Amino acid sequence: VAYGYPSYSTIRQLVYKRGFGKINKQRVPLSDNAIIEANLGKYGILSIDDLIHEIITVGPHFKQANNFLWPFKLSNPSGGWGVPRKFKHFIQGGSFGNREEFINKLVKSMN
Amino acid sequence: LRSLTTVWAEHLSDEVKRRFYKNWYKSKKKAFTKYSAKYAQDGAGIER
Amino acid sequence: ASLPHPKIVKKHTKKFKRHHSDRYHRVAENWRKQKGIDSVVRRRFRGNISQPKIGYGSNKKTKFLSPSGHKTFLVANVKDLETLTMHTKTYAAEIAHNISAKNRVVILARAKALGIKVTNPKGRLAL
């Protein structure tokens, strides 16, 4: 894996572009705030920004909020990975592992 | 080495010009005859 | 003048020939899958022939559609031709290979009256 700390900008683009809901065990694009109202209305979540607000600030209903989001399907980075070999730790010159803030740069290329 | 040119005599004997024929007996013998025209003229074709 | 239809797409038009059908005369070209343990065609190596599979299934909205835009329907005689009376814009008639040269003029003269397209209106014409 390659994980990091996402910023507000990174979360916002992921949901707006790649935001998909797991409703009735089916993957349904959000594309509208009513869909979130139908499912996530139980916890006081109404719009797409309410859902994001639960991600940026780990709110009391993070799990229900997070699980409602489908696993995102990202693309390969637009500018390449930036390294010759992926499967070395980010400290060691590769890509996998914890990179503190550079997941924002990476994910946007993937996004 | 590449052969530049050849200059033959004015008259060739018969025995040498049998070397140019496989069937010598039936032939007008027709060899160098137009080439003999280079002779009979002082400076026409040979010395050049 | 058939109904509108999307552009006809085939996804594969070259006929699937059995493997090695060109190598031997006993192995006819009718497709048969290779079941061998060491078959290259079966394992799908690079540079080998391609095997039929459902991904080649035609578009449903244009499946069975001849280039004219009409589906073909073999007819035997006038009674069978009439079955296409109200449906000239989706189906075409075809005269069977065993319909006699004298009978054929009967259906054509009728189909022209009903305006039904006949795919092979030249068989057994003497001129």
Binding site: - | - | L74, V75, H87, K89
Partner: protein, 167 residues
């Protein structure tokens, strides 16, 4: 029978299309095109002819004339992409162009019956053009060598790189 019958039949009524949402909006010419500009034509009979842009028509076409007396290009319309626009400009003030329009160029496409086996100009068209160019030719006279410029064809010679040159 040959085949029995298809048990069900499909409908033969053509379905109406959904209401589209594609509205037409006025076209935006690039800033390089301004009436009065000298153009170089890239296609057609008059490809490579330096020529004068007079007006922007309705159907995204550029009303263009030689002027005809200079090089022999009449009042034509050409595509905004098949031209090369330059920095040279000739004044178009006092020139009437509003008379021409789309219907002015009507071809009346010949019938299929009319077939050209083996083998003219409207009078009013010619007198139209001579009206315009007389107001433009004098304008050319002020700038030296412009008259010869518009009678001279354009070309590309060796060593000439379009991506690097300036027009």
């Amino acid at each position: 029978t040959a085949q029995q019958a298809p048990k069900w039949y499909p409908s033969e009524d053509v379905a109406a299309p959904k209401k589209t949402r594609k509205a037409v909006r006025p076209q935006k010419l690039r800033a390089s095109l301004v009436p009065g500009t000298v153009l170089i034509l890239l296609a057609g009979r008059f490809r490579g002819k330096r020529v004068v842009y007079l007006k922007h028509l309705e159907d995204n076409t550029l009303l263009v004339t030689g002027p005809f007396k200079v090089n022999g290009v009449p009042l034509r319309r050409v595509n905004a992409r098949y031209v090369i626009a330059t920095s040279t400009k000739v004044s178009v003030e006092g020139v009437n162009v509003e008379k021409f329009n789309v219907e002015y160029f009507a071809k009346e496409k010949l019938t299929k019956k009319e077939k050209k086996e083996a083998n003219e100009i409207k009078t009013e068209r010619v007198e139209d053009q001579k009206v315009v160019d007389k107001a433009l030719i004098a304008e050319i006279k002020k700038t030296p060598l412009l008259k010869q410029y518009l009678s001279a064809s354009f070309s590309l010679k060796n060593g000439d790189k379009p991506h690097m040159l300036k027009f």
